[PDB]
Design an enzyme around this catalytic site. Structure first.
Site, PDB file in Angstrom:
ATOM      1  N   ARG A   1     -74.790  18.967   4.607  1.00 62.52           N
ATOM      2  CA  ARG A   1     -73.557  18.929   5.464  1.00 62.52           C
ATOM      3  C   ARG A   1     -73.187  17.604   6.081  1.00 62.52           C
ATOM      4  O   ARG A   1     -72.094  17.215   6.324  1.00 62.52           O
ATOM      5  CB  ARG A   1     -72.255  19.737   5.522  1.00 62.52           C
ATOM      6  CG  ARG A   1     -72.005  20.494   4.194  1.00 62.52           C
ATOM      7  CD  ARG A   1     -70.635  20.196   3.571  1.00 62.52           C
ATOM      8  NE  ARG A   1     -69.515  20.621   4.431  1.00 62.52           N
ATOM      9  CZ  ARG A   1     -68.983  21.875   4.136  1.00 62.52           C
ATOM     10  NH1 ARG A   1     -69.342  22.576   3.121  1.00 62.52           N
ATOM     11  NH2 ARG A   1     -68.049  22.360   4.979  1.00 62.52           N
TER      12      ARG A   1
ATOM     13  N   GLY B   1     -69.119  21.230   9.105  1.00 62.12           N
ATOM     14  CA  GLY B   1     -69.917  20.090   8.700  1.00 62.12           C
ATOM     15  C   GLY B   1     -71.183  20.060   9.533  1.00 62.12           C
ATOM     16  O   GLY B   1     -71.378  20.917  10.397  1.00 62.12           O
ATOM     17  N   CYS B   2     -72.044  19.079   9.274  1.00 60.94           N
ATOM     18  CA  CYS B   2     -73.331  18.974   9.952  1.00 60.94           C
ATOM     19  C   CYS B   2     -73.206  18.591  11.422  1.00 60.94           C
ATOM     20  O   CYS B   2     -72.532  17.617  11.750  1.00 60.94           O
ATOM     21  CB  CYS B   2     -74.204  17.941   9.246  1.00 60.94           C
ATOM     22  SG  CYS B   2     -74.912  18.513   7.690  1.00 60.94           S
ATOM     23  N   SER B   3     -73.867  19.357  12.286  1.00 59.02           N
ATOM     24  CA  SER B   3     -73.988  19.034  13.711  1.00 59.02           C
ATOM     25  C   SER B   3     -72.639  18.705  14.354  1.00 59.02           C
ATOM     26  O   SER B   3     -72.551  17.824  15.212  1.00 59.02           O
ATOM     27  CB  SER B   3     -74.957  17.862  13.905  1.00 59.02           C
ATOM     28  OG  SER B   3     -76.279  18.221  13.542  1.00 59.02           O
ATOM     29  N   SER B   4     -71.595  19.425  13.955  1.00 63.47           N
ATOM     30  CA  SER B   4     -70.244  19.128  14.427  1.00 63.47           C
ATOM     31  C   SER B   4     -70.021  19.541  15.883  1.00 63.47           C
ATOM     32  O   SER B   4     -69.045  19.109  16.499  1.00 63.47           O
ATOM     33  CB  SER B   4     -69.203  19.810  13.531  1.00 63.47           C
ATOM     34  OG  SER B   4     -69.377  21.216  13.509  1.00 63.47           O
TER      35      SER B   4
END
Lengths: 8, 482
Positions: free
Chosen positions: A8, B382-385
């Protein structure tokens, strides 16, 4: 055996 | 006085079928302070010593350290992926993530069991049944009269204390076991009586018998309650968390997983979002939410071009259901410019960001602040949003985004896509059955949709527990226009 997932 | 002012000036403006739960720690981190607030209701105020079971177990520092260690390893699996990608390294990769999923699961189970214990009913969204509660009151007072040495003046318990017993859930269901929880709450009741001057020694109390009789009273309550079930209350819970508690995936605690729960930075923020709600284009509980038109949204899909599986999963569906019939803007396989991003936030009722991180690489946080108003409800897949207070989510809330969905830690593409697809189907952005051309759509609030969508992931804890929503319930207005 599933494809490694993409980060991600 | 301040709780009185908070109730009057903030809480009594909140939709009455929602409640607000404030979680904080006492000075030494020894106690979990829980305050439940609801319009027209007296506040629940609880202070729960985390280690209370010992003198009858792990402390906050131990719990948080375990959580952060798990998260660190989860994050590592998300990026070691590319290197590991092979054919038998697949097996080890999946095994590692399965093991982490089980570890996080067990941590959350232990938090619920030890820290929350019998007070988990404070989170219950069950509708109040005044007549049944007073029936329970009579039976429960009978239990106290029979078993307390002090009753061989009587303190009268507040209704909210009794609601904690009701909040444990349906006592008539197979597999129900409330014994440890009920023990915890009976200590609480004895301690309340003690505080108000009706004193008892624990050693002189047959708690085990009180548990049996109290459980029998609860079975009587729920047998009668089930005869007139709750159809659709659209109950929602909003969490206000102190700085050290944001990293915990509260929504994924076993007792909360089924509930529509969102987060809010402050009561001031909540109040602001409520006063800016848009009515639907249409006694209707849905009217409490913000209603965002389906028309005119924006999706940003695979902006860095490397997320080909994510692109494949959604591109045709989005063209068919959003771009073609509902006038959505699409940005695909190219980075959005800062003006494009800001314009989407200004004009689109819904913005879908399916890329890396929070999108902060494309838009500066301070320009999100310059916005006269952020129209968009934002999904940051998304990552760590939503992670690690200051951050992207903080600024969207400042800008007045009705809601923002984001992740507390790193995730991988296919599994967050399973979640995202579930959110869109539940919310009604895409027709039911799209992910599995379709027509006919659901109408859950965004918060309800997020809670349900956690079911879609291969990993409920490693992936889905990362997903949280900051803001208020948003409903899709299918026929609406801005």
């Amino acid at each position: 055996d599933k494809s490694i997932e993409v980060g991600r | 006085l301040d709780l009185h002012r908070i109730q009057r000036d903030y809480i009594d403006l909140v939709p009455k079928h929602w409640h607000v739960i404030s979680l904080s720690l006492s000075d030494g981190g020894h106690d979990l302070c829980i305050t439940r607030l609801q319009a027209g209701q007296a506040p629940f105020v609880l202070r729960l010593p985390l280690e209370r079971a010992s003198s009858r177990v792990f402390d906050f520092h131990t719990g948080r350290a375990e959580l952060l260690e798990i998260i660190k390893e989860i994050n590592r699996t998300c990026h070691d992926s590319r290197d590991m990608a092979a054919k038998g390294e697949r097996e080890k990769w999946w095994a590692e993530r399965e093991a982490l999923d089980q570890r996080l699961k067990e941590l959350l189970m232990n938090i619920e069991h030890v820290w929350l214990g019998g007070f988990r009913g404070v989170f219950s969204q069950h509708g109040r049944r005044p007549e049944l509660l007073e029936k329970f009151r009579a039976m429960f007072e009978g239990v106290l009269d029979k078993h307390l040495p002090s009753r061989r003046t009587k303190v009268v318990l507040d209704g909210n204390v009794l609601e904690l017993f009701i909040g444990l859930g349906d006592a008539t269901k197979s597999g129900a076991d409330f014994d440890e929880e009920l023990t915890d709450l009976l200590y609480f009741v004895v301690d309340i009586l003690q505080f108000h001057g009706e004193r008892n020694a624990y050693d002189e109390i047959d708690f085990d018998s009180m548990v049996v009789e109290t459980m029998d009273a609860l079975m009587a309550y729920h047998a009668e309650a089930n005869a007139a079930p709750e159809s659709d209350s659209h109950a929602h819970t909003i969490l206000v968390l102190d700085k050290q508690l944001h990293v915990f995936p509260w929504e994924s605690l076993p007792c909360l997983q089924g509930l529509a729960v969102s987060r809010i930075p402050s009561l001031a923020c909540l109040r602001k979002l409520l006063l800016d709600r848009r009515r639907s284009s249409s006694e209707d509980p849905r009217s409490a939410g913000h209603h965002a038109p389906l028309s005119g949204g924006t999706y940003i899909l695979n902006p860095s071009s490397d997320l080909l599986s994510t692109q494949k999963t959604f591109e045709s569906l989005f063209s068919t259901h959003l771009h073609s019939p509902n006038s959505w803007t699409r940005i695909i396989s190219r980075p959005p410019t800062e003006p494009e991003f800001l314009s989407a936030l200004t004009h689109s009722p819904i913005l879908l960001y399916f890329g890396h991180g929070s999108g902060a690489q494309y838009i500066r946080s301070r320009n999100i602040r310059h916005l006269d108003h952020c129209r968009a409800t934002v999904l940051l897949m998304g990552c760590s949003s939503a992670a690690l207070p200051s951050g992207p989510v903080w600024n969207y809330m400042l800008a007045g985004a009705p809601a923002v969905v984001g992740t507390l830690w790193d995730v991988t593409d296919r599994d967050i896509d399973r979640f995202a697809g579930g959110v869109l189907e539940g919310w009604g952005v895409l027709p039911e059955g799209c992910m599995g051309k379709k027509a006919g759509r659901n109408g859950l609030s965004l918060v309800q949709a997020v809670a349900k969508a956690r079911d879609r992931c291969r990993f409920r804890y490693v992936t889905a527990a990362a997903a949280v929503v900051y803001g208020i319930p948003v409903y899709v207005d299918v026929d609406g226009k801005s």
